[PDB]
Design a protein around this ligand. Structure first.
Ligand SMILES: NC(=O)C1=CN([C@@H]2O[C@H](COP(=O)(O)OP(=O)(O)OC[C@H]3O[C@@H](n4cnc5c(N)ncnc54)[C@H](OP(=O)(O)O)[C@@H]3O)[C@@H](O)[C@H]2O)C=CC1
Ligand SMILES: NC(=O)C1=CN([C@@H]2O[C@H](COP(=O)(O)OP(=O)(O)OC[C@H]3O[C@@H](n4cnc5c(N)ncnc54)[C@H](OP(=O)(O)O)[C@@H]3O)[C@@H](O)[C@H]2O)C=CC1
Lengths: 242, 247
């Protein structure tokens, strides 16, 4: 009897899949709104439930839980940085969906891998839930590193797309999104088809150090320094030299 | 009135979608083959052409173009870095397709934004061509092509350094095929950026303001790679991508 305590895409993802007890949000308006598309109820000043998904910001997850504290259920959350051991109680689990949530694009779930960890009653639950949406998952103490990897893989890339957007913007291209995507999408796919070490191309890849150097000045001129740039090049060589 | 130099995968492109007079190559056969499939002649000890697409490695465009010597013909290369101006002649231009050339994947032809930059009278020649192949493009001054290329690098190459960092830590955790996992994580962001503004695609902990993780994840990062240089930089920017929205 899946209970979700967050009103905002992700529970929407799970709802749409595992289509249910209650759906809570700090304002029934949104709670209702959702439980009227998949079916359930409402209120963060709700009834007594008993599995519960606390899909709210990390820094809250713990608190929000130790505040509803009712009816024998199985505590779970989607944070890949924190364990279930935060709840500090019976049947605790953690199901992390390595993906970024456009709720439409996440409808290609069968590709999503899950980071699972729990206890007696908990683990098997998220394993089944995990199994019910995609093919498999992974079990994690290494929570930190495992999650860091998801951030420097689905978060950090925006910092590049952003950087590229700024300079294109300044260059007159009014709507660069379409261009930036084409390139970034390519790299993504190419990162697959070719494992990382064989996926590289560009200036550094082939020498052309006069291009890397001249673009360092061009990087500095557009922004205020060359730190990130020098960092990515030092990285790229590490890649390139494989 | 198109003559091409360099039987590269990229010329087979403009040829195919533009059905020509003289296709030069170092090999007479190689030129003769594309002429057989499209229509032209050959040799770099050629006849005397007169527009000339010099589609060869960025490394020889100038030299080669100075070993072509022919009369009345606007010159154009497709270098993403180099400028038309490298030709130092009255009728020049530069057409750059942001795409990587499988030959037929180029059936994606409709969605190739072009980076043009040409002469006064050399510009409308390339401007006309992009309009055909795919009506998406934009002119850029010759004194800004280095900026332009820089951009492509950030969106093209740079991500790789991110794929590298993660694969490294997924393997530290003994993950089967990390690239898959990586591709999933990254493509979700790669595509989303098409249906929305770059800055509307950031979803992580910085976004939520979960500094508590941003901070520990940085010590975890230091622990794994020796420093926090790259980590600090992106985080600074992401916290910047997230505030822009606060408006
Ligand atoms: N974005 C990502 O990159 C991914 C995040 N996750 C995990 O998902 C969880 C949340 O992710 P995310 O999508 O950012 O969520 P959002 O920040 O969009 O979540 C909004 C939801 O959190 C609730 N909320 C906001 N502030 C508070 C508060 N002060 N107290 C209680 N509830 C609050 C909202 O309340 P209300 O409905 O009342 O408005 C709403 O239900 C985390 O555990 C995260 O680690 C998993 C995969 C990916
Ligand atoms: N590859 C891509 O995805 C893209 C390339 N471009 C631009 O297109 C141009 C060519 O790019 P690229 O794909 O590397 O090309 P290729 O290496 O595929 O080009 C091969 C062609 O270049 C000729 N060539 C190679 N070396 C020499 C030389 N030393 N002297 C004379 N001719 C030579 C070949 O000789 P021969 O004729 O004898 O067979 C052949 O015709 C560049 O200006 C590049 O910046 C732009 C966008 C994308």
């Amino acid at each position: 009897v899946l209970n979700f305590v967050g009103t905002g895409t992700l529970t929407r993802f799970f709802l749409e899949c595992l289509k249910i007890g209650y759906i809570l949000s700090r304002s029934i308006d949104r709670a209702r709104n959702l439980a009227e598309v998949y079916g359930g109820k409402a209120a963060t000043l709700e009834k007594h439930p008993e599995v519960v998904f606390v899909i709210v910001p990390d820094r809250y997850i713990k608190t929000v839980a130790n505040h509803l504290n009712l009816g024998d259920a199985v505590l779970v959350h989607c944070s890949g940085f924190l364990s279930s051991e935060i709840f500090k109680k019976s049947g605790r689990a953690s199901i992390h969906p390595n993906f970024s949530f456009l709720e439409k694009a996440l409808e290609m779930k069968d590709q999503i891998v899950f980071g699972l960890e729990g206890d007696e009653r908990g683990l098997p639950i998220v394993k089944k839930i995990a199994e019910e949406i995609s093919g498999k998952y992974f079990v994690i103490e290494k929570k930190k590193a495992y999650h860091l990897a998801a951030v420097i893989a689905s978060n950090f890339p925006v910092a590049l797309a952003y950087l590229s957007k700024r300079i294109y913007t300044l260059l007159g291209l009014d709507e660069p999104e379409l261009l930036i995507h084409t390139l970034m999408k390519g790299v993504a796919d190419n990162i697959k088809k070719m494992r990382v070490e064989c996926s590289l191309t560009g200036p550094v890849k082939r020498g052309d150090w006069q291009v890397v150097e001249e673009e360092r000045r061009e990087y500095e001129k557009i922004f205020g320094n060359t730190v990130l740039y020098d960092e990515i090049v030092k990285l790229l060589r590490e890649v390139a030299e494989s």
